[PDB]
Amino acid sequence: AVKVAINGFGRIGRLAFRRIQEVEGLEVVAVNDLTDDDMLAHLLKYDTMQGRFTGEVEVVDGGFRVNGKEVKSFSEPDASKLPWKDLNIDVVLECTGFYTDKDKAQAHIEAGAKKVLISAPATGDLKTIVFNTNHQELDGSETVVSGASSTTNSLAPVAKVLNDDFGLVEGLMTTINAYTGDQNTQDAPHRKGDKRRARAAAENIIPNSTGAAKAIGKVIPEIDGKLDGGAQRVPVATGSLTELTVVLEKQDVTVEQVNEAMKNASNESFGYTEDEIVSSDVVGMTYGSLFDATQTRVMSVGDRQLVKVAAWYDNEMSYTAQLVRTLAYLAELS
Amino acid sequence: AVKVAINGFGRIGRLAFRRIQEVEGLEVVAVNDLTDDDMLAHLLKYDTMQGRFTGEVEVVDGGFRVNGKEVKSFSEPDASKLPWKDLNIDVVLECTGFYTDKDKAQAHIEAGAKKVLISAPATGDLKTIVFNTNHQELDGSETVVSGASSTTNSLAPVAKVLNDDFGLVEGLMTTINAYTGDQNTQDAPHRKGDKRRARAAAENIIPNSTGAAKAIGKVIPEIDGKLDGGAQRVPVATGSLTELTVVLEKQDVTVEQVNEAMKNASNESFGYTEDEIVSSDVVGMTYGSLFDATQTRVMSVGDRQLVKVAAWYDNEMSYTAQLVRTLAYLAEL
Amino acid sequence: AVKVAINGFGRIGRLAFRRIQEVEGLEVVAVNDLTDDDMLAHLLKYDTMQGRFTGEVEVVDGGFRVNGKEVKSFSEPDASKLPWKDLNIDVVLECTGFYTDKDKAQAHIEAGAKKVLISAPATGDLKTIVFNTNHQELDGSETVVSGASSTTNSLAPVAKVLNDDFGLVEGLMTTINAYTGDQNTQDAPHRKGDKRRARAAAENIIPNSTGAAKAIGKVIPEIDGKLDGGAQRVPVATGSLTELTVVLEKQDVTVEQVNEAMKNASNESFGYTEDEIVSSDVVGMTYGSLFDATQTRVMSVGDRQLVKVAAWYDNEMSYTAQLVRTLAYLAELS
Amino acid sequence: AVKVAINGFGRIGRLAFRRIQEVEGLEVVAVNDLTDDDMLAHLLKYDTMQGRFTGEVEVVDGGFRVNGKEVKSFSEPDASKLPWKDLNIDVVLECTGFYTDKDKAQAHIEAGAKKVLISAPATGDLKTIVFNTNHQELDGSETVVSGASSTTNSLAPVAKVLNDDFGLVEGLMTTINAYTGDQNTQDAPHRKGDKRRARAAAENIIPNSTGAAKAIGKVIPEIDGKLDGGAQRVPVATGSLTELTVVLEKQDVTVEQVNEAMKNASNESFGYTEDEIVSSDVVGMTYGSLFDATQTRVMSVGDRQLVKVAAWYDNEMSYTAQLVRTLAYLAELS
Numbered sequence A, C, D: 001a002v003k004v005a006i007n008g009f010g011r012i013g014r015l016a017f018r019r020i021q022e023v024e025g026l027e028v029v030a031v032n033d034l035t036d037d038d039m040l041a042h043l044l045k046y047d048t049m050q051g052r053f054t055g056e057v058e059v060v061d062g063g064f065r066v067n068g069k070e071v072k073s074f075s076e077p078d079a080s081k082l083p084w085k086d087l088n089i090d091v092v093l094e095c096t097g098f099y100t101d102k103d104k105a106q107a108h109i110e111a112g113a114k115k116v117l118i119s120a121p122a123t124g125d126l127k128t129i130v131f132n133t134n135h136q137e138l139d140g141s142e143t144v145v146s147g148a149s150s151t152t153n154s155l156a157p158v159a160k161v162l163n164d165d166f167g168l169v170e171g172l173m174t175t176i177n178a179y180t181g182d183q184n185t186q187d188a189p190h191r192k193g194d195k196r197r198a199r200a201a202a203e204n205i206i207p208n209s210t211g212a213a214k215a216i217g218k219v220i221p222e223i224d225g226k227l228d229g230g231a232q233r234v235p236v237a238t239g240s241l242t243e244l245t246v247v248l249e250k251q252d253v254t255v256e257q258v259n260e261a262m263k264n265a266s267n268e269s270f271g272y273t274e275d276e277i278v279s280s281d282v283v284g285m286t287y288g289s290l291f292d293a294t295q296t297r298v299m300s301v302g303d304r305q306l307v308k309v310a311a312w313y314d315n316e317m318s319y320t321a322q323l324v325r326t327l328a329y330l331a332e333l334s
Numbered sequence B: 001a002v003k004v005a006i007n008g009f010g011r012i013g014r015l016a017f018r019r020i021q022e023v024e025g026l027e028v029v030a031v032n033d034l035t036d037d038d039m040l041a042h043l044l045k046y047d048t049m050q051g052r053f054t055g056e057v058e059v060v061d062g063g064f065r066v067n068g069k070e071v072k073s074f075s076e077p078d079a080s081k082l083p084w085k086d087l088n089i090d091v092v093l094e095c096t097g098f099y100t101d102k103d104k105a106q107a108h109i110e111a112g113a114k115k116v117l118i119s120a121p122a123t124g125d126l127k128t129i130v131f132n133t134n135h136q137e138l139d140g141s142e143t144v145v146s147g148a149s150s151t152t153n154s155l156a157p158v159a160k161v162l163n164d165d166f167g168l169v170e171g172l173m174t175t176i177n178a179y180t181g182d183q184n185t186q187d188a189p190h191r192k193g194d195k196r197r198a199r200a201a202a203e204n205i206i207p208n209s210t211g212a213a214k215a216i217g218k219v220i221p222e223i224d225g226k227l228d229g230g231a232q233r234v235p236v237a238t239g240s241l242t243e244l245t246v247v248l249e250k251q252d253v254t255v256e257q258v259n260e261a262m263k264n265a266s267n268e269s270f271g272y273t274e275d276e277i278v279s280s281d282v283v284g285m286t287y288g289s290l291f292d293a294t295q296t297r298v299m300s301v302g303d304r305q306l307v308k309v310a311a312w313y314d315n316e317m318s319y320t321a322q323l324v325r326t327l328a329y330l331a332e333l
Ligand SMILES: NC(=O)c1ccc[n+]([C@@H]2O[C@H](COP(=O)([O-])OP(=O)(O)OC[C@H]3O[C@@H](n4cnc5c(N)ncnc54)[C@H](O)[C@@H]3O)[C@@H](O)[C@H]2O)c1
Pocket: A007, A008, A009, A010, A011, A012, A013, A032, A033, A034, A076, A077, A078, A095, A096, A097, A098, A119, A120, A149, A150, A180, A181, A182, A315, A316, A319, D186, D187, D188, D189
């Protein structure tokens, strides 16, 4: 089996852990965070939005036991000190939010891990992967890889279809986004100095910047710099929606053609629906993106057309499913 | 003073009432709704999002007393039965949500009112007004008028500036919107059969249609049919944001030009800000629209440009302020 | 199989429907509500707090099809007009909220149903059942029965233990409750004239009355009138907690004795836990009540003692699970 | 004028600032927090639950300017290094949450301030004051004082009236409380290791412990140890309610007597209402406690009585109002 260690047992870390239970041939042997065992175990068992963990979870001294299997747990802020070498870690899932750079994440390799997959956009000389859009870029000699962002994974399969079938001139994106752990409960100073992430998360529409906007150019090179846009963080705890408004090379495009193009591209990463669903309907789903055809709009004024589409995503579970597929693929190549 | 009656003492009706207290020369002499006096008075005094009513509110039998002034109240579902004639009502503010058609609203006139201002887009042969964008269209012979929607009021002053200064080819709109009373508390059947407004309002991002998309053509005729878009209803109780993505006639447009063009057009209906505010910051505001310059984007790929802008609005108080200005102007004619 | 018709395909009706799929020998053959098929089918498939319906749901003209089985649907406000006779309905689950009286609910019997089970406290000459507290009261000659309320079901098994083991002098109850469909979205006039249920449901702590307070006397006659209390409706969409503060007949009672007395009484209707859970953790659970031992308090001043306990409950699924057990028992006697 | 410095420009610190503008003879000359000027100024102007600041706020380098008045600002985690001596600070309002101990708070004195008022319960050899209940205990020689907690301020005036008028045997408290800055946005490890405050704040009913429970004994000595209870943190951002269930020395008490006893005691710290208000209705209020007579209950079984009362409080502004009155009183004596 492929020996996985999770750095940062947060939202993405814990769900990665859950999802790996469902997936044969991957084994989490260790976790690292900044807290005690009791906490880690508790937060795995109980999950506000994602539901109770099915299996049995028990605290031991090593760490904790999940359906009989032991999981070593550590409490070490500095990744280079982790005993990855001694536990023959194959791949670290880096989920702390503090190693989002190729050079930083190199700490895990020095500790003894063979590969690192970052659960976010990351700066530096590395590949950025959305599963089922560009994982084929991986030859297996990669040492550090980025799994991109939630939004990127919701967007890439939609943009690919538009660019391939109609030609993408330009587009602007808005993502209507669940609030996350880096927002504040009450209006208060923000670590990164963001005056908007500083505000009460569950009481506000909060404009913010998005990675996706340009992480996208790294995933689909031929549309590099053709897309931009931002986020609106709103008071749902998980579940999100990406709206995309574009100018295409083909005019005389119909709503019917756009939808059919999307359906024909659907797979396990990219779902298709015609049901009038809402955000809570996508909580826990494992498509990386779910095209909602009921939201497709074409605006035609004389010669010229504007096209609008929207895709749903569980920014937690949709991203996690995608990240684990990338993990499994990256591991099968070496 | 100008004799006002409010039909439907709901969210817009009660705030209209409050706003009128701030504004000289308008007097609410009557309200009509579907409940008792105690309830009406209570819901005026206490307000979840808009805060406590400052003055004194006391229930009497006529209805209730507000800072000494009596307000007659009625419990009559059929508008034509209201004693408008006997109380010399000058203008009815129609806020029930059930008379949003010129012919229907005519009931108030038969009851004896001299004019009706509908607090929503309304079908039929009437003018649709966003104050400080097209109120000048009113000549004072109008009998039934629409005050448009809250989204239309957030959008009209933004669209006018783009169309005037840059030439508007086409655009798509998304409004990120507070939930309203015509949504359900828990997933349940919806009166109008909307499978999305049926869902838990405070637990969901809920896609929906918008009036504004095309009430806009009635307010700014020269851009009729050049705009469309929809809503996303989200778990805030009030405060909203209109995002607009457009293709303009001028290319080589800058973020700086767009912003300055908006600032130059600001007045009491159309505010301008460069502060990184969030929705709760606009709760209670009396601008009909607040342009947020931090959100302006310009996307340039070779020859061709996409422009994005965004304006805040308290769907409750921004619209109410705008409706009352329109009321006051309509009355002065 | 036992032929069930659900009147009022609301929160309790739809979940009753879902729960019945899990339970052998009960078959829902009809539903009645005030809307079209597309709506009924849609609201069964998708559920904000309770999650997606697992099976397949397809709209036909009769009504709709669930995992192949047809379900006739009706749009008829007046219960006596329903074709219960023609479909040989054995038991109607009455969930509309508008037939909470023995005489009113008799309409279903005139329509042709054999028994009616009301999903609330109901006035009149009928028995009030909390499953595993007093279902043994049923001899099978009953024609109209009440399934009590969700708070009654969370409280009854707790009060029975206290009264049996310690003797109950008197007590006061507070339930910290999820908001329900009879509260308003925004401050607005309320149908029943309740000035507090009129207020924005998800932005307020809202004091209110509770049925439980005295539905309890009908379930456990020997403590009739010994209990009272009210509700605080708060901004969670489901999941609730009953706090109970009592004077007992034994003094020198210990935390340890109270807890153990509860654990010893636990069954499928009454769960026991020592985990520091929160409301969302009980969403979807099928215990009618979940005793939380971490919340047990005993206050002793000289001779005299006050005792405090707390039980969780998903006001939706906990009540539904209980109602369906009562349905199944009532049908086995019939 | 009395020279005030606010240590910790958070929820209580900023509201203290606002409230001081309304109150003659107190002048804030400095603030300390852990962030830049732009942030401080921004969060004073804009307030999610409390509304926009009325006056003008402008950033300068000293710090910021409020209605023309300069306010120096600092970025210094260690209190003993603040230039309190050089700015002749009379009183520091200590609102960080990190100096809640008489010995720790002594750092401000070494820095040069003349007195410290801690905006929370604080350990060590000091007085704990709820204004209009026990501020008369201050003789002016005090150097470090505690302003108690929000719950204590909501509860003291209610318990004093019950104990003076009926004799308090014993009682249990439940506070249904707004969520605060020390809870998490999403389920995540908690600094203090509280498995409950670790959970999503705006999606949960969260049981927790309360200071009040026994800060109370320090404020009303003669009922020391006669009260206990806890909190339920719920998804409102501000506004709270304290429920109290008590056994009194007088039996044959009536609802009418209890209510009248409270009204007769009302002042600027203790309000009285018979309106069916909800939590949002007390947001911004400056009573330290508002007795709600609609919620008064008396439970009588034969000889023996249980009594229940409830008082509202804006855990932010009610506490702040109370804190400032104590500030003003403390300053007038020294
Ligand atoms: N919707 C989403 O939450 C989402 C989606 C996709 C990607 N991501 C990315 O995933 C990453 C983690 O996000 P999250 O939401 O789980 O955050 P989180 O706060 O819930 O989890 C972060 C975890 O890391 C721990 N931690 C912090 N410093 C550490 C250290 N040096 N060593 C070990 N543990 C440390 C914290 O205890 C916490 O458990 C972020 O980069 C985020 O950008 C988030």
